[PDB]
Amino acid sequence: MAYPYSDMPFGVELDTSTLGSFGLGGPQTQLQMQMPAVDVNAAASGSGGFMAGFSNIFSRDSMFGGVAPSGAQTGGWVLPALGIGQAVFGAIGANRQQRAARDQLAESRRQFDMNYGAQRQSINTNLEDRQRARVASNPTAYESVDSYMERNRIR
Amino acid sequence: MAYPYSDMPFGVELDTSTLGSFGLGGPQTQLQMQMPAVDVNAAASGSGGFMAGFSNIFSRDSMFGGVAPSGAQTGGWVLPALGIGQAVFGAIGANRQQRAARDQLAESRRQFDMNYGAQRQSINTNLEDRQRARVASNPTAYESVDSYMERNRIR
Amino acid sequence: MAYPYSDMPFGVELDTSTLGSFGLGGPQTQLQMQMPAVDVNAAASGSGGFMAGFSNIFSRDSMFGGVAPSGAQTGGWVLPALGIGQAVFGAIGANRQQRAARDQLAESRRQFDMNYGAQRQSINTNLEDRQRARVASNPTAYESVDSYMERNRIR
Amino acid sequence: MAYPYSDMPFGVELDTSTLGSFGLGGPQTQLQMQMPAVDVNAAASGSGGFMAGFSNIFSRDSMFGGVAPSGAQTGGWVLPALGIGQAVFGAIGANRQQRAARDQLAESRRQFDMNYGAQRQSINTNLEDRQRARVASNPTAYESVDSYMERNRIR
């Protein structure tokens, strides 16, 4: 476009993976960038054009609201901020619980698969040491090692 | 900025690790620093500008509030303090429960891993002793110990 | 400060340990001390300035409250006392339940560790008595006890 | 104090132990004593100053309450007595449940401690009867009983 910047490689790297991985549902794939400006300079000078540098509200009415005589009340931003934080933290907790459940299930699967692997190795070892006598005593009148090693071998 | 002080390496030292490790979600990474001034001197003199040594309210109505005739009541700080303490203690309890659950799961993982390690070392030494006699009896007519270790040894 | 008193050893000894150990969340770390004075002497004379020996209420209205005609009621201290007792006993019960759960978990840990230790000692006994015959039969063609206790010994 | 009485030995005796032991959370540590007097004699004469033998309510209004015309009702003692009984029985039930849980846990502990002791003693018997043959076969090339009873004896 007019100002491509460098978002295309970032989008390519992101691909279409969903939430998960290991960093509590999305790790810090990128790196920590440096500060944009040395001084506040009222945001980015003309480009920014913000009023936070000169606001200096320091007023309870803006934070916790206030009511003048004859009603006409105004509410501050503290309550909406608390609500937003509540929502975000509830979502984070739900994600954490789901991730913990997935972990536990994966751990159980690993446990069973690994126990089976150990038992299979043990059974195969028992089998080849049992057939060692057969193939060493009378090789001509008995079978060969390979016959068992790809016929009677535990998967 | 005009006054960097000594905060430049602090950010690099902290990196971006979240709460965890062993200090109940962050141990005493920093050290202990001597208290600046023996005498309060109204905080940092002109810089402080606080009423620590002048307010001295020593008033019972401030804590518990009070209502004058014709309404126009005021609330003391006791209720906000109680609410803040309630919130903090609830959060600490939730964090403690989460840490306990994580500790129990890691404990179970460790116990299973160490039990397997014991079983595996036992079976490996059993196989080593078993094949030692084979390699000692007919070295020419039997496989080498190195081959058995690299092919028939439990991982 | 002007009156440091002798609280520094208390702070040094206490450190930052939280509730736990064995004394239902903090045992009697300190010792017992005699009373400041045999006789009340109106609290600490001028320092006290109380009405312990002069109030002598001995009335039902102060304890159970009371309402005079035309509104203007007064509430006794019985309800606050009951509320405070309720809060304290609830906290004590919660602490007791947490301590019981911790004790049960620690008991399960001592259980598993002791069982593994016994089994490991039995296995080591079996191994060494099996290898004693090997090292006593033919010391030349067989291995030594050192090899077995350094690499064929269960931790 | 002016009237120390004999509470010091009891204060020394009870120490600071909490509810427990076997008597539903505190057994009958003390003993039985005779009544102060065969006849009531109006409580303790002047000290008592009660109406045990003079009140003689014998009326339904005192127990079940009653309301005269134009309001101005009075409540009987039956509701307070029922409330007090309710509270006492609830507390007793809670104590009983806690005691039952503690007893079950202690029973499980004794359960496994005794099972492990039996198994350990059986293992020790197996060990020493196996070692008896070794020490009786040839003492010159074998060890003594003390070495095996000290180094490889299950605790």
Coordinates of C-alpha atoms in Angstrom, one line a residue:
Chain A
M1 CA 0.0 0.0 0.0
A2 CA 1.1 3.6 0.4
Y3 CA 3.0 2.9 3.6
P4 CA 3.7 -0.9 3.7
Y5 CA 6.1 -0.7 6.7
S6 CA 7.1 -4.2 7.7
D7 CA 3.9 -5.9 8.9
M8 CA 3.9 -8.5 6.1
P9 CA 6.8 -10.6 7.5
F10 CA 5.1 -10.4 10.9
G11 CA 1.9 -11.7 9.4
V12 CA 3.7 -14.4 7.5
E13 CA 5.4 -15.5 10.7
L14 CA 2.1 -15.5 12.7
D15 CA 0.5 -17.8 10.1
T16 CA -2.9 -19.0 11.5
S17 CA -2.0 -20.6 14.8
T18 CA -4.6 -20.3 17.6
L19 CA -4.2 -19.7 21.3
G20 CA -2.0 -22.1 23.2
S21 CA 1.7 -22.9 23.2
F22 CA 3.4 -22.3 26.6
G23 CA 3.3 -18.6 27.5
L24 CA -0.2 -18.7 29.2
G25 CA -1.8 -18.7 25.8
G26 CA 0.7 -17.0 23.5
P27 CA 4.3 -16.4 24.5
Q28 CA 6.5 -13.4 23.9
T29 CA 7.4 -14.3 20.3
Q30 CA 8.6 -10.8 19.5
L31 CA 11.4 -8.9 21.4
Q32 CA 11.5 -6.0 23.8
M33 CA 11.7 -2.8 21.8
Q34 CA 13.4 0.4 22.9
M35 CA 11.6 3.6 23.9
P36 CA 10.3 5.6 21.0
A37 CA 11.1 9.1 22.3
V38 CA 13.7 10.3 24.8
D39 CA 11.3 12.9 26.4
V40 CA 7.5 13.0 26.5
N41 CA 7.4 16.2 24.3
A42 CA 3.6 16.1 24.4
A43 CA 3.4 12.6 22.7
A44 CA 4.9 12.8 19.2
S45 CA 4.8 16.6 18.9
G46 CA 2.5 17.5 16.0
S47 CA 1.9 13.9 15.1
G48 CA 0.6 13.0 18.6
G49 CA -1.2 16.2 19.5
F50 CA -2.4 14.9 22.9
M51 CA -3.5 16.7 26.0
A52 CA -2.0 14.3 28.7
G53 CA 1.1 16.4 29.0
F54 CA -1.0 19.5 30.1
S55 CA -4.0 17.8 31.6
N56 CA -2.7 17.5 35.2
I57 CA -6.3 16.8 36.3
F58 CA -5.4 15.7 39.9
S59 CA -9.1 15.8 40.6
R60 CA -11.3 13.4 42.5
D61 CA -14.3 14.3 40.3
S62 CA -12.7 12.9 37.2
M63 CA -11.7 9.6 38.8
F64 CA -14.6 8.9 41.2
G65 CA -17.2 11.1 39.6
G66 CA -19.3 13.7 41.4
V67 CA -22.8 15.2 41.7
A68 CA -23.7 18.9 41.8
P69 CA -26.8 20.2 43.6
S70 CA -30.0 19.5 41.7
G71 CA -28.8 16.1 40.5
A72 CA -26.9 16.3 37.2
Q73 CA -24.4 13.6 38.1
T74 CA -21.4 12.3 36.2
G75 CA -19.6 9.0 36.7
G76 CA -15.8 8.6 36.7
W77 CA -13.8 6.2 34.7
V78 CA -12.7 4.2 37.7
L79 CA -15.8 1.9 37.7
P80 CA -15.5 1.1 34.0
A81 CA -11.8 0.4 34.4
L82 CA -12.5 -2.0 37.3
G83 CA -15.2 -3.7 35.2
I84 CA -12.8 -4.1 32.3
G85 CA -10.1 -5.5 34.5
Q86 CA -12.6 -7.9 36.1
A87 CA -13.6 -9.2 32.6
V88 CA -10.0 -9.6 31.5
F89 CA -8.9 -11.4 34.6
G90 CA -11.9 -13.7 34.5
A91 CA -11.0 -14.7 30.9
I92 CA -7.4 -15.2 31.9
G93 CA -8.5 -17.5 34.7
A94 CA -10.7 -19.5 32.4
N95 CA -7.8 -19.9 29.9
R96 CA -5.5 -21.0 32.7
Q97 CA -8.0 -23.7 33.9
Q98 CA -8.4 -25.0 30.4
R99 CA -4.6 -25.2 29.9
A100 CA -4.2 -27.0 33.2
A101 CA -6.8 -29.6 32.2
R102 CA -5.0 -30.1 28.9
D103 CA -1.8 -30.5 30.6
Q104 CA -3.1 -33.1 33.0
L105 CA -4.6 -35.1 30.1
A106 CA -1.4 -34.9 28.2
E107 CA 0.6 -36.1 31.2
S108 CA -1.7 -39.1 31.6
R109 CA -1.3 -40.0 28.0
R110 CA 2.5 -39.7 28.2
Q111 CA 2.4 -41.9 31.4
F112 CA 0.4 -44.7 29.7
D113 CA 2.5 -44.6 26.5
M114 CA 5.8 -44.6 28.3
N115 CA 4.8 -47.5 30.6
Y116 CA 3.7 -49.4 27.5
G117 CA 7.0 -48.7 25.8
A118 CA 9.0 -49.9 28.8
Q119 CA 6.9 -53.1 29.1
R120 CA 7.3 -53.7 25.3
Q121 CA 11.1 -53.3 25.6
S122 CA 11.2 -55.7 28.5
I123 CA 9.0 -58.3 26.8
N124 CA 11.1 -58.1 23.6
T125 CA 14.2 -58.6 25.6
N126 CA 12.7 -61.6 27.4
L127 CA 11.8 -63.0 23.9
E128 CA 15.2 -62.6 22.3
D129 CA 17.0 -64.1 25.3
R130 CA 14.6 -67.0 25.3
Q131 CA 15.1 -67.6 21.5
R132 CA 18.9 -67.2 22.0
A133 CA 19.0 -70.7 23.5
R134 CA 16.9 -72.1 20.6
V135 CA 19.1 -70.5 17.9
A136 CA 22.3 -71.5 19.7
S137 CA 21.5 -75.1 20.6
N138 CA 20.2 -76.6 17.3
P139 CA 20.3 -73.9 14.6
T140 CA 19.6 -76.4 11.9
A141 CA 16.6 -78.1 13.5
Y142 CA 15.2 -74.8 14.8
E143 CA 14.3 -71.4 13.2
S144 CA 16.5 -68.4 12.7
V145 CA 16.7 -65.2 14.7
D146 CA 15.0 -63.1 12.0
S147 CA 11.9 -65.3 11.8
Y148 CA 11.0 -64.3 15.3
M149 CA 12.5 -60.8 15.2
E150 CA 9.9 -59.8 12.5
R151 CA 7.2 -62.4 13.3
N152 CA 6.9 -62.8 17.1
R153 CA 8.1 -59.3 18.0
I154 CA 6.0 -57.0 20.2
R155 CA 5.1 -53.8 18.5
Chain B
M1 CA 16.0 11.8 29.9
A2 CA 17.5 14.4 32.2
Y3 CA 18.2 12.1 35.2
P4 CA 18.7 8.4 34.4
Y5 CA 19.7 7.7 38.0
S6 CA 20.6 3.9 38.0
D7 CA 17.4 2.3 36.6
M8 CA 19.1 1.3 33.3
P9 CA 20.4 -2.1 34.3
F10 CA 17.3 -2.9 36.5
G11 CA 15.1 -3.5 33.5
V12 CA 17.7 -5.8 31.9
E13 CA 18.1 -7.7 35.2
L14 CA 14.4 -8.2 35.6
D15 CA 14.0 -9.4 32.0
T16 CA 10.2 -10.3 31.5
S17 CA 9.7 -13.2 33.9
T18 CA 6.3 -13.5 35.4
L19 CA 5.4 -14.4 39.0
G20 CA 6.7 -17.7 40.2
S21 CA 10.0 -19.3 41.2
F22 CA 10.0 -19.8 45.0
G23 CA 9.5 -16.5 46.8
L24 CA 5.7 -16.8 46.7
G25 CA 5.7 -15.2 43.2
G26 CA 9.0 -13.3 43.2
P27 CA 11.7 -13.5 45.8
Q28 CA 13.9 -10.7 47.2
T29 CA 15.8 -10.2 44.0
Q30 CA 17.2 -6.9 45.2
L31 CA 19.2 -6.2 48.4
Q32 CA 18.4 -4.2 51.6
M33 CA 19.2 -0.5 51.5
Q34 CA 19.9 1.7 54.6
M35 CA 17.2 4.1 55.6
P36 CA 18.1 7.6 54.4
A37 CA 17.6 10.0 57.4
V38 CA 17.4 9.3 61.2
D39 CA 14.9 12.2 61.7
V40 CA 11.8 12.5 59.6
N41 CA 12.3 16.2 59.1
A42 CA 8.9 16.4 57.4
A43 CA 9.8 13.8 54.8
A44 CA 12.4 15.1 52.3
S45 CA 12.2 18.7 53.6
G46 CA 10.9 20.8 50.8
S47 CA 10.7 17.9 48.4
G48 CA 8.4 16.0 50.7
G49 CA 6.0 18.6 52.0
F50 CA 3.9 16.3 54.0
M51 CA 2.0 16.7 57.3
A52 CA 3.3 13.7 59.2
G53 CA 4.5 15.7 62.1
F54 CA 1.7 18.3 62.0
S55 CA -1.7 16.7 61.3
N56 CA -1.9 14.5 64.4
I57 CA -5.7 14.3 64.1
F58 CA -6.1 11.9 67.1
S59 CA -9.9 12.1 66.4
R60 CA -12.3 9.2 66.9
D61 CA -15.0 10.5 64.5
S62 CA -12.6 10.2 61.5
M63 CA -12.4 6.4 61.8
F64 CA -16.1 5.7 62.4
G65 CA -17.6 8.6 60.5
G66 CA -20.6 10.5 62.0
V67 CA -23.8 12.2 61.0
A68 CA -24.9 15.7 62.2
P69 CA -28.5 16.8 62.6
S70 CA -30.3 17.4 59.3
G71 CA -28.4 14.6 57.5
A72 CA -25.2 15.5 55.8
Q73 CA -23.3 12.4 56.9
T74 CA -19.7 11.4 56.3
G75 CA -18.0 8.0 56.1
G76 CA -14.8 7.2 57.9
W77 CA -11.8 5.3 56.4
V78 CA -12.6 2.2 58.3
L79 CA -15.0 0.8 55.7
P80 CA -12.6 1.4 52.7
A81 CA -9.7 -0.1 54.8
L82 CA -11.8 -3.2 55.6
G83 CA -12.8 -3.6 52.0
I84 CA -9.2 -3.2 50.7
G85 CA -8.0 -5.8 53.3
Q86 CA -10.7 -8.2 52.3
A87 CA -9.7 -7.9 48.6
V88 CA -6.0 -8.4 49.3
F89 CA -6.6 -11.4 51.6
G90 CA -8.9 -13.0 49.0
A91 CA -6.3 -12.6 46.3
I92 CA -3.5 -14.0 48.5
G93 CA -5.7 -17.0 49.3
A94 CA -6.3 -17.7 45.7
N95 CA -2.7 -17.4 44.8
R96 CA -1.8 -19.8 47.7
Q97 CA -4.3 -22.3 46.5
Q98 CA -2.9 -22.2 42.9
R99 CA 0.6 -22.6 44.2
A100 CA -0.3 -25.5 46.3
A101 CA -2.0 -27.3 43.4
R102 CA 1.0 -26.7 41.2
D103 CA 3.4 -28.0 43.9
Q104 CA 1.3 -31.1 44.3
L105 CA 1.3 -31.8 40.5
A106 CA 5.1 -31.3 40.2
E107 CA 5.5 -33.6 43.3
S108 CA 3.5 -36.4 41.6
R109 CA 5.5 -35.9 38.4
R110 CA 8.8 -36.1 40.3
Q111 CA 7.7 -39.3 42.2
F112 CA 6.7 -41.1 39.0
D113 CA 9.9 -40.0 37.3
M114 CA 12.2 -41.2 40.1
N115 CA 10.3 -44.6 40.4
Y116 CA 10.8 -45.1 36.7
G117 CA 14.5 -44.2 37.0
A118 CA 15.0 -46.8 39.7
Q119 CA 13.2 -49.5 37.7
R120 CA 15.2 -48.6 34.6
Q121 CA 18.6 -48.7 36.3
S122 CA 17.7 -52.0 37.8
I123 CA 16.7 -53.6 34.6
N124 CA 19.7 -52.1 32.8
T125 CA 22.1 -53.6 35.3
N126 CA 20.3 -56.9 35.1
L127 CA 20.7 -57.0 31.3
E128 CA 24.4 -56.0 31.7
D129 CA 25.1 -58.8 34.1
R130 CA 23.1 -61.2 31.8
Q131 CA 25.1 -60.4 28.7
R132 CA 28.4 -60.3 30.6
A133 CA 28.3 -64.1 31.0
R134 CA 27.4 -64.4 27.3
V135 CA 30.4 -62.3 26.2
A136 CA 32.7 -64.1 28.7
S137 CA 31.7 -67.7 27.6
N138 CA 32.1 -67.7 23.8
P139 CA 33.4 -64.2 22.7
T140 CA 33.8 -65.4 19.1
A141 CA 30.4 -67.1 18.8
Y142 CA 28.4 -64.3 20.6
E143 CA 27.8 -60.6 20.0
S144 CA 30.0 -58.0 21.6
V145 CA 29.1 -56.1 24.8
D146 CA 29.3 -52.8 22.9
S147 CA 26.8 -54.0 20.3
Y148 CA 24.3 -55.1 23.0
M149 CA 24.7 -51.8 24.9
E150 CA 24.1 -49.8 21.7
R151 CA 21.2 -52.0 20.5
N152 CA 19.7 -53.9 23.4
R153 CA 19.9 -51.6 26.4
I154 CA 16.9 -49.9 28.0
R155 CA 16.9 -46.1 27.5
Chain C
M1 CA 14.5 7.0 66.9
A2 CA 14.2 8.8 70.3
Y3 CA 12.8 5.7 72.0
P4 CA 14.1 2.6 70.2
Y5 CA 13.2 0.5 73.2
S6 CA 14.3 -3.2 72.6
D7 CA 12.2 -4.3 69.6
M8 CA 15.2 -5.0 67.3
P9 CA 15.9 -8.5 68.6
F10 CA 12.2 -9.3 68.1
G11 CA 12.3 -8.2 64.5
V12 CA 15.6 -10.1 63.9
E13 CA 14.1 -13.3 65.3
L14 CA 10.7 -13.1 63.6
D15 CA 12.3 -12.4 60.2
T16 CA 9.3 -12.8 57.7
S17 CA 7.9 -16.3 58.4
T18 CA 4.2 -16.5 57.8
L19 CA 1.6 -18.6 59.7
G20 CA 2.4 -22.3 59.9
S21 CA 4.8 -24.6 61.7
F22 CA 2.9 -26.4 64.5
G23 CA 1.3 -23.9 66.9
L24 CA -1.9 -23.6 64.9
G25 CA -0.3 -21.0 62.7
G26 CA 2.4 -19.6 65.0
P27 CA 3.5 -21.1 68.4
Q28 CA 4.4 -19.4 71.6
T29 CA 7.8 -18.2 70.4
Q30 CA 8.1 -15.7 73.3
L31 CA 8.1 -16.6 77.0
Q32 CA 5.9 -15.6 79.9
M33 CA 6.3 -12.4 82.0
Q34 CA 5.0 -11.3 85.3
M35 CA 2.2 -8.7 85.6
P36 CA 3.1 -5.0 85.6
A37 CA 1.5 -4.5 89.0
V38 CA -0.5 -6.5 91.6
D39 CA -3.0 -3.8 92.0
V40 CA -4.8 -2.1 89.1
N41 CA -4.2 1.4 90.6
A42 CA -6.4 2.9 87.9
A43 CA -4.5 1.5 84.9
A44 CA -1.0 3.1 84.6
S45 CA -1.9 6.0 86.9
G46 CA -1.7 9.2 84.8
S47 CA -0.6 7.3 81.7
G48 CA -3.6 5.1 81.8
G49 CA -6.4 7.5 82.7
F50 CA -9.1 4.8 82.5
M51 CA -12.2 4.1 84.6
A52 CA -11.7 0.4 85.4
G53 CA -12.3 0.8 89.2
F54 CA -14.7 3.8 88.9
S55 CA -17.2 3.0 86.1
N56 CA -18.8 0.0 87.9
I57 CA -21.8 -0.1 85.4
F58 CA -23.5 -3.2 86.7
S59 CA -26.6 -2.4 84.6
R60 CA -28.6 -4.5 82.1
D61 CA -29.2 -1.5 79.7
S62 CA -25.5 -1.1 78.9
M63 CA -25.1 -4.7 78.0
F64 CA -28.4 -5.4 76.3
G65 CA -29.1 -1.9 75.0
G66 CA -32.3 0.0 75.6
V67 CA -34.8 2.5 74.0
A68 CA -36.3 5.4 75.8
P69 CA -39.7 6.8 74.9
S70 CA -39.8 8.8 71.7
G71 CA -37.0 7.0 69.9
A72 CA -33.4 7.9 70.8
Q73 CA -32.2 4.3 71.5
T74 CA -28.8 3.1 72.6
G75 CA -27.2 -0.3 71.7
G76 CA -25.2 -2.4 74.1
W77 CA -21.8 -3.9 73.5
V78 CA -23.1 -7.5 73.4
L79 CA -23.8 -7.4 69.7
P80 CA -20.3 -6.1 68.8
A81 CA -18.8 -8.6 71.2
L82 CA -20.7 -11.5 69.6
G83 CA -19.7 -10.3 66.1
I84 CA -16.0 -10.1 67.0
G85 CA -16.1 -13.6 68.6
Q86 CA -17.8 -14.9 65.5
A87 CA -15.1 -13.4 63.2
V88 CA -12.2 -14.7 65.4
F89 CA -13.7 -18.2 65.6
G90 CA -14.3 -18.4 61.9
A91 CA -10.7 -17.4 61.2
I92 CA -9.4 -20.0 63.7
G93 CA -11.5 -22.7 62.0
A94 CA -10.2 -21.8 58.6
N95 CA -6.7 -21.9 59.8
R96 CA -7.3 -25.3 61.5
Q97 CA -8.7 -26.7 58.3
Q98 CA -5.7 -25.5 56.2
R99 CA -3.3 -26.9 58.8
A100 CA -5.1 -30.3 58.7
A101 CA -4.9 -30.4 54.9
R102 CA -1.2 -29.6 55.0
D103 CA -0.6 -32.2 57.7
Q104 CA -2.4 -34.9 55.6
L105 CA -0.3 -34.0 52.5
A106 CA 2.9 -34.1 54.5
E107 CA 1.9 -37.5 55.9
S108 CA 1.3 -38.9 52.4
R109 CA 4.8 -37.6 51.4
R110 CA 6.4 -39.3 54.4
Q111 CA 4.4 -42.4 53.5
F112 CA 5.7 -42.6 49.9
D113 CA 9.3 -41.7 50.8
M114 CA 9.5 -44.3 53.6
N115 CA 8.0 -47.0 51.4
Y116 CA 10.5 -46.3 48.6
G117 CA 13.4 -46.2 51.1
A118 CA 12.4 -49.6 52.5
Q119 CA 12.0 -51.1 49.0
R120 CA 15.3 -49.6 47.9
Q121 CA 17.2 -51.0 50.9
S122 CA 15.7 -54.5 50.2
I123 CA 16.7 -54.3 46.5
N124 CA 20.2 -53.3 47.4
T125 CA 20.5 -56.1 49.9
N126 CA 19.3 -58.6 47.2
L127 CA 21.9 -57.2 44.7
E128 CA 24.8 -57.3 47.1
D129 CA 24.0 -60.9 48.4
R130 CA 23.6 -62.0 44.7
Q131 CA 27.0 -60.5 43.8
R132 CA 28.8 -61.8 46.9
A133 CA 28.6 -65.3 45.4
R134 CA 30.0 -64.0 42.1
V135 CA 33.0 -62.3 43.7
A136 CA 33.6 -65.2 46.1
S137 CA 33.5 -67.9 43.4
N138 CA 36.1 -66.7 40.9
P139 CA 37.7 -63.3 41.6
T140 CA 39.7 -63.5 38.3
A141 CA 37.2 -63.7 35.5
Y142 CA 34.4 -61.8 37.4
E143 CA 34.1 -58.2 38.4
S144 CA 34.8 -56.7 41.8
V145 CA 32.5 -55.3 44.5
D146 CA 33.7 -51.8 43.7
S147 CA 32.2 -51.8 40.2
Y148 CA 28.9 -53.0 41.6
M149 CA 28.6 -50.5 44.4
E150 CA 29.7 -47.6 42.1
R151 CA 27.5 -48.4 39.0
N152 CA 25.2 -51.4 39.8
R153 CA 23.9 -49.9 43.1
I154 CA 20.4 -48.4 43.4
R155 CA 20.3 -44.9 44.8
Chain D
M1 CA -4.8 -11.0 95.1
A2 CA -7.1 -10.3 98.1
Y3 CA -8.8 -13.7 97.6
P4 CA -6.5 -16.0 95.7
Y5 CA -8.7 -19.0 96.5
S6 CA -7.2 -22.2 94.9
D7 CA -7.3 -21.5 91.2
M8 CA -3.5 -21.6 90.8
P9 CA -3.2 -25.4 90.9
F10 CA -6.0 -25.6 88.3
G11 CA -4.3 -23.0 86.1
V12 CA -1.1 -25.0 86.3
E13 CA -3.0 -28.3 85.6
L14 CA -4.9 -27.3 82.4
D15 CA -1.9 -25.5 80.8
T16 CA -3.1 -24.4 77.3
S17 CA -4.3 -27.6 75.7
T18 CA -7.2 -27.1 73.2
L19 CA -10.3 -29.3 72.9
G20 CA -9.5 -32.9 72.0
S21 CA -8.3 -36.0 73.9
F22 CA -11.3 -38.5 74.1
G23 CA -14.1 -36.9 76.0
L24 CA -15.8 -35.3 73.0
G25 CA -13.2 -32.5 73.1
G26 CA -12.1 -32.4 76.7
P27 CA -12.9 -35.2 79.2
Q28 CA -13.9 -35.0 82.9
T29 CA -10.5 -33.9 84.1
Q30 CA -11.9 -32.8 87.5
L31 CA -13.8 -35.0 90.0
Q32 CA -17.3 -34.9 91.6
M33 CA -18.2 -32.8 94.7
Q34 CA -21.1 -32.8 97.1
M35 CA -23.8 -30.2 96.9
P36 CA -23.3 -26.9 98.8
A37 CA -26.4 -27.6 100.9
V38 CA -29.3 -30.0 101.2
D39 CA -31.9 -27.3 101.3
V40 CA -32.0 -24.3 98.9
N41 CA -32.5 -21.8 101.8
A42 CA -33.1 -19.1 99.2
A43 CA -29.8 -19.6 97.4
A44 CA -26.8 -18.5 99.6
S45 CA -29.0 -16.6 102.0
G46 CA -28.0 -12.9 101.8
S47 CA -25.3 -13.6 99.2
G48 CA -27.8 -15.2 96.8
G49 CA -30.8 -12.9 97.1
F50 CA -32.8 -14.8 94.5
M51 CA -36.5 -15.9 94.3
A52 CA -36.1 -19.6 93.8
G53 CA -38.7 -20.5 96.4
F54 CA -40.7 -17.3 96.1
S55 CA -41.3 -16.6 92.4
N56 CA -43.4 -19.7 91.6
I57 CA -44.6 -18.4 88.2
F58 CA -46.8 -21.4 87.5
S59 CA -48.4 -19.6 84.7
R60 CA -48.6 -19.9 80.9
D61 CA -48.0 -16.2 80.3
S62 CA -44.4 -16.4 81.7
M63 CA -43.5 -19.4 79.6
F64 CA -45.3 -18.8 76.3
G65 CA -45.6 -15.0 76.5
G66 CA -48.7 -12.9 76.1
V67 CA -50.1 -9.7 74.7
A68 CA -52.6 -7.4 76.5
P69 CA -55.1 -5.3 74.6
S70 CA -53.6 -2.2 73.1
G71 CA -50.3 -3.9 72.3
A72 CA -47.6 -3.8 74.9
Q73 CA -46.6 -7.5 74.6
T74 CA -44.1 -9.5 76.5
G75 CA -42.1 -12.5 75.3
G76 CA -41.6 -15.6 77.4
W77 CA -38.3 -17.4 78.1
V78 CA -39.2 -20.4 75.9
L79 CA -37.8 -18.8 72.7
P80 CA -34.5 -17.8 74.3
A81 CA -34.2 -21.3 75.8
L82 CA -34.8 -22.9 72.5
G83 CA -32.3 -20.7 70.8
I84 CA -29.6 -21.5 73.4
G85 CA -30.3 -25.2 73.1
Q86 CA -30.1 -24.9 69.3
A87 CA -26.7 -23.2 69.5
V88 CA -25.3 -25.7 72.1
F89 CA -26.4 -28.7 70.1
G90 CA -25.0 -27.3 66.8
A91 CA -21.6 -26.7 68.5
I92 CA -21.7 -30.2 70.0
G93 CA -22.4 -31.7 66.6
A94 CA -19.6 -29.8 64.9
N95 CA -17.2 -31.0 67.6
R96 CA -18.4 -34.6 67.2
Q97 CA -17.8 -34.4 63.4
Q98 CA -14.3 -33.0 63.9
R99 CA -13.5 -35.7 66.4
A100 CA -14.8 -38.4 64.1
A101 CA -12.6 -37.2 61.2
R102 CA -9.5 -37.0 63.5
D103 CA -10.2 -40.5 64.7
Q104 CA -10.5 -41.9 61.2
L105 CA -7.2 -40.3 60.1
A106 CA -5.4 -41.6 63.2
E107 CA -6.9 -45.1 62.5
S108 CA -5.5 -44.9 59.0
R109 CA -2.1 -44.0 60.4
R110 CA -2.1 -46.9 62.8
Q111 CA -3.3 -49.1 60.0
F112 CA -0.3 -48.6 57.8
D113 CA 2.2 -48.2 60.6
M114 CA 1.3 -51.7 61.9
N115 CA 1.2 -53.2 58.4
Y116 CA 4.6 -51.8 57.6
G117 CA 6.0 -53.1 61.0
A118 CA 4.7 -56.6 60.3
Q119 CA 6.1 -56.6 56.8
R120 CA 9.5 -55.3 58.0
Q121 CA 9.8 -57.9 60.7
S122 CA 8.9 -60.6 58.2
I123 CA 11.6 -59.3 55.8
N124 CA 14.1 -59.2 58.7
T125 CA 13.3 -62.9 59.5
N126 CA 13.8 -63.9 55.8
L127 CA 17.1 -62.0 55.8
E128 CA 18.5 -63.6 59.0
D129 CA 17.4 -67.1 58.1
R130 CA 19.1 -66.7 54.7
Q131 CA 22.2 -65.3 56.4
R132 CA 22.3 -68.1 59.0
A133 CA 23.1 -70.7 56.3
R134 CA 25.9 -68.4 54.9
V135 CA 27.5 -68.0 58.3
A136 CA 27.1 -71.7 59.1
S137 CA 28.5 -73.0 55.8
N138 CA 32.1 -71.6 55.9
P139 CA 33.0 -68.8 58.3
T140 CA 36.5 -68.2 56.9
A141 CA 35.5 -66.9 53.4
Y142 CA 32.1 -65.4 54.6
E143 CA 31.1 -62.5 56.8
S144 CA 29.8 -62.4 60.4
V145 CA 26.2 -61.9 61.5
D146 CA 26.9 -58.5 62.9
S147 CA 28.0 -57.0 59.5
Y148 CA 24.8 -58.0 57.8
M149 CA 22.7 -57.0 60.8
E150 CA 24.2 -53.6 60.9
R151 CA 24.8 -52.7 57.2
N152 CA 22.0 -54.5 55.3
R153 CA 19.3 -54.8 57.9
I154 CA 15.9 -53.2 57.2
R155 CA 15.1 -50.6 59.9

